[PDB]
Design a protein around this ligand. Structure first.
Ligand SMILES: [Cl-]
Ligand SMILES: [Cl-]
Ligand SMILES: [Cl-]
Ligand SMILES: [Cl-]
Ligand SMILES: [Cl-]
Lengths: 257, 259, 261, 251
């Protein structure tokens, strides 16, 4: 049985709550150099002007991690940081005021690294988004022979398990794929597999037109199931258009944000 | 109840094609020219043929439009379809004119001999009929029963059109459930798949700018295609009909439901 | 078995003051996206096209109001104009009387003897050429029933009958297009075309859904074709402004060291 | 000699992927980050992967990059290719770090390391860097010099019992690029790695590469391809898909 978006666990992200209500928070991400504070801030204010409620920035390095405080001081909406496995960058961004870190626990390595992150996260009440991706499933998951709905949830489970073992339940999860049937199938199962809020997203298509049609369709079928607490529409275009498609999708179903 | 999957629906012939009973959806659009202007309508259908359109609907508001069907036919490949709202003479004229499928409202037409001539006209010529229920066009008693347009009322209307034709030994039926509201559209099609075995023609009433029409159509149709129903479809957009085909092709590519 | 004729060996066919065929040049073309009857809009789109380097422009002539507007459009532009009419011969006669510089129509579609010889003699009198345009997606039913689906042999079967209708009227002022979506078919249709007849070929590829996909698919396909040494004129079809079509054609020709003259 | 069809080229493994012996080309891209900056590099690969990239090349200009190779692989799921130019040592380093393929042109020590790990070597021939003696023989860069340069390199590996070779024939002039791959395909049956060196703007490089590679693909050769652009690595994957997808050449 699927956990409706209204009975999912509430997760505080800055001043907003994701999960435990029927409000789909709109998110996006920047295209700028995260360490280029002026450019990043400029693009963020254009996203805020468009209707963006939460925005993510890639933190590939120290320059980027160092830019966090300077960015957040010049913005109004919550700022999430992208980090695949570097615990030092995780720690630097957290210290800097990020509102949430998108990091997959199982990639961090040795337990002491995993704890340095979770402890920092609890210290200032920041959540983690577990972001499962169809193109980047663990090497071992030689088990299915290719990305499948089952391989995504299992990878997801593994990541939640590490946080729950550390008494950490402030978690948001995403199951992002490029294929629509796999997309729908993945969120369906993750909703039946766990109670955390689901961050909806489909992989960027080659063109803006392809991506607009595919995402509108895939997320359309997921929202109709009563699931999803937040969403990000990924498109080969200026981020503002992602906010526009997201707004149009939610208005279409008569959904509030 | 059981949702009749698309592969479990009744196969009908629309020209040289088979709609229903399989796991593929045939793309359809409509010409924006006056059917009377032969070259104009052909020129537009040629662009749609080039684009990948598989079935095309032409305006048949009057007798001149109906009388040009054979001329259009000599110059194209794909099946020609036509919607007749009220006047049965237009349906009859279109049928004898060489149409491949007609969209009629048995209950509106009028006299029993009127419907019998069209049913027979279509039955004789071996042509299918499409029953198209539209949320904004429900019968008076339907709206009085439910109070406003609703999935159940569209389904009530559908069955009756179907029953009129079934009572005249007519079964080459395709059913459309067109609404503007996606929530209604999604429901309307889900209950139709549970209420009968005929193939369903998926369409959403166009609303807003091209940008909004494209998003809302993709959204609603995404939820319906994931339900495993739909055997044919058309995207409606105030734009060059070719754009409708583009959108339909992307949608099918996404789900892997193209012919 | 028959050798592909090299673009420099195709029959030279004059279009306006230009010569398509019997040379190593590739004439670049585009098509308007306006209503032909809207003279002002159409002439302004053509002027933008000329500015980007377009050499020949085709306009649809779907009704009588568009064919009567040919004369006034011609008076305002400096590049040869082309009427695209699928079969209505009263619309082509008007286009020809309007002073069109070429007509894109397939004679086997007209397709009544008094109707064919009329359009034929009218063109003969004005000394204007006819481009036959076979499109994989708009092939005749008797081809489809025979081959099953669109094939190169089928497109070649089609082109040959339209060509015969004309050759049988002692008309040889002909250019041929073989349009397909599938890049593999397009490539084979044009090599099969070069072996069957010596008429210069007009290279085109159906427009993909988007500008990006269209640019890649068309450069990849036409590049394949151009490298065989065939084709005498081309048109890129894109879901974009016609100016984008001219820019892709220029950069594509630039890539092969080929010129427009 | 007639050209060796892509389906008849000598199979070569790269990670879990086969390169050669089938009618489908593998998509490659290349990172732009500092290979020694691990999260940075991994982040780019992660976007590449998602976009449909199948193999990725990372620059190894020195030992910093060479040492990061292992940490990069424990994070990614597509095979990595190293690109070494002058130092035989950096290639040795990249191989110890688990590189899945080394693109390179002591000499026996590199092969022994390549033998030991069971990894191939992509001989990379380029029109912009042919040795002086073939330039002195042919006068300028040409298809005959390229194939001759590729054969002299193929010879040395073969004499050392190493046959797991993949070959590229890089040039900026479309007509030379075409002629070279045709020429290549005839001389040897090793799989071909298609690429066109970039020139001009993004617009210009997109048209040129698709045009050249289309002609090449039409001839039925090539088992792997790379679209060289000066932008986000995902733009190279975007061009590559449309191209392969248009010709009917799957993953
Ligand atoms: Cl570790
Ligand atoms: Cl450490
Ligand atoms: Cl727990
Ligand atoms: Cl009457
Ligand atoms: Cl409205």
């Amino acid at each position: 049985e699927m956990t409706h978006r209204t009975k999912t666990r509430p997760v505080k992200v800055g001043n907003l709550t994701i999960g435990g209500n029927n409000e789909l928070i709109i998110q996006s991400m920047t295209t700028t150099k995260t360490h280029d504070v002026e450019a990043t801030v400029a693009e963020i204010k254009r996203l805020e002007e468009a209707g963006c409620q939460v925005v993510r920035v890639a933190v590939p390095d120290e320059r980027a991690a160092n830019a966090i405080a300077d960015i957040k001081k010049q913005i109004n909406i919550p700022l999430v940081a992208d980090i695949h496995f570097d615990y030092r960058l995780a720690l630097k961004a957290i210290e800097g005021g990020i509102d949430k870190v998108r990091i997959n626990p199982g990639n961090i390595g040795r337990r002491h690294k995993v704890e340095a992150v979770v402890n920092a996260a609890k210290e200032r009440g920041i959540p983690i988004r577990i972001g499962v991706n169809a193109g980047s499933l663990e090497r071992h998951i030689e088990k299915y022979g290719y990305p499948t709905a089952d391989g995504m949830v299992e990878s997801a489970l593994h990541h939640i398990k590490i946080l729950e073992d550390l008494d950490f339940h402030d978690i948001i999860v995403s199951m992002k794929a490029s294929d629509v049937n796999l997309a729908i199938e993945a969120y369906e199962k993750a909703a039946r597999a766990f109670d955390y809020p689901l961050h909806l997203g489909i992989t960027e298509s080659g063109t803006l037109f392809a991506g607009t049609v595919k995402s509108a369709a895939g997320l359309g079928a997921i929202l109709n199931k009563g699931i999803g607490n937040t969403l990000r529409i990924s498109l080969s275009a200026d981020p503002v258009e992602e906010v526009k498609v997201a707004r149009e999708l939610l208005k279409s179903f008569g959904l509030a944000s």
